[PDB]
């Protein structure tokens, strides 16, 4: 694989930059994120072209805001499913990493 981003990295939004930290991921399995596409390793950005590249929709596979936040199904672990199951062991870190607003994402 390419090197881990040693450093907070931008996620893009349409009008809204989140800055993500690999660091405390470090025990997740990069393909958690970074899942497999045509059964091949893939490290692009996810909002690419072709892959989540609907920047502005709410839902929907394409749409990058509902990969990160959908609490719903998904066929891979958003940011807001695995951090609700965090927050449900470690309830200190609810508005950290869930909160709308004075999040860690959303500071
Ligand atoms: C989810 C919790 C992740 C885990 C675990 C890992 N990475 Fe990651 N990575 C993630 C995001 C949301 C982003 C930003 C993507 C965007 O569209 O802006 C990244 C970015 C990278 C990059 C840079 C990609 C690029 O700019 O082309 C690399 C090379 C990368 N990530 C590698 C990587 C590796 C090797 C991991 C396991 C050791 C790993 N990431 C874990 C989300 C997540
Ligand atoms: C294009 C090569 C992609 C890249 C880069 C990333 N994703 Fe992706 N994602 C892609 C497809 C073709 C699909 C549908 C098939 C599947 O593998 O499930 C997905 C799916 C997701 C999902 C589930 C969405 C749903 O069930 O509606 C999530 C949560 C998701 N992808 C997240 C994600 C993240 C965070 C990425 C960057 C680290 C990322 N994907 C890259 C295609 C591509
Ligand atoms: C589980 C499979 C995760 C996924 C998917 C994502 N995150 Fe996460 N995140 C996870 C853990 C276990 C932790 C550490 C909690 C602890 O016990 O301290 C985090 C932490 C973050 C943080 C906070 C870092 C800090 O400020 O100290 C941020 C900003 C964060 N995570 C962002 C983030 C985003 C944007 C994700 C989707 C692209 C994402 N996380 C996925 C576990 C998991
Ligand atoms: C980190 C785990 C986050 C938490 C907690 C919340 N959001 Fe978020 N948000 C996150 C990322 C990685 C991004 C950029 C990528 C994307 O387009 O989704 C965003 C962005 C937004 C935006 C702007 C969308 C745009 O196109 O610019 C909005 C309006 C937004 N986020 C809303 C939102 C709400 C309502 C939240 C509480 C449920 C919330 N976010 C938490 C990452 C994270």
Do not use: I, N, W
């Amino acid at each position: 694989a390419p090197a881990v981003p040693d450093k907070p990295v931008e996620v893009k939004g349409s009008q809204k930059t989140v800055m993500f930290p690999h660091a405390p991921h470090e025990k997740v399995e990069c393909v958690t994120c970074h899942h497999l596409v045509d059964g091949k390793e893939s490290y692009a950005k996810c909002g690419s072209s072709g892959c989540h590249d609907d920047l502005t929709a709410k839902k929907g596979e394409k749409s990058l805001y509902y990969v990160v936040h959908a609490r719903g199904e998904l066929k891979h672990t958003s940011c807001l499913a695995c951090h609700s199951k965090v927050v449900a062991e470690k309830p200190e870190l609810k508005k950290d990493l869930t909160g709308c607003a004075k999040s860690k994402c959303h500071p």
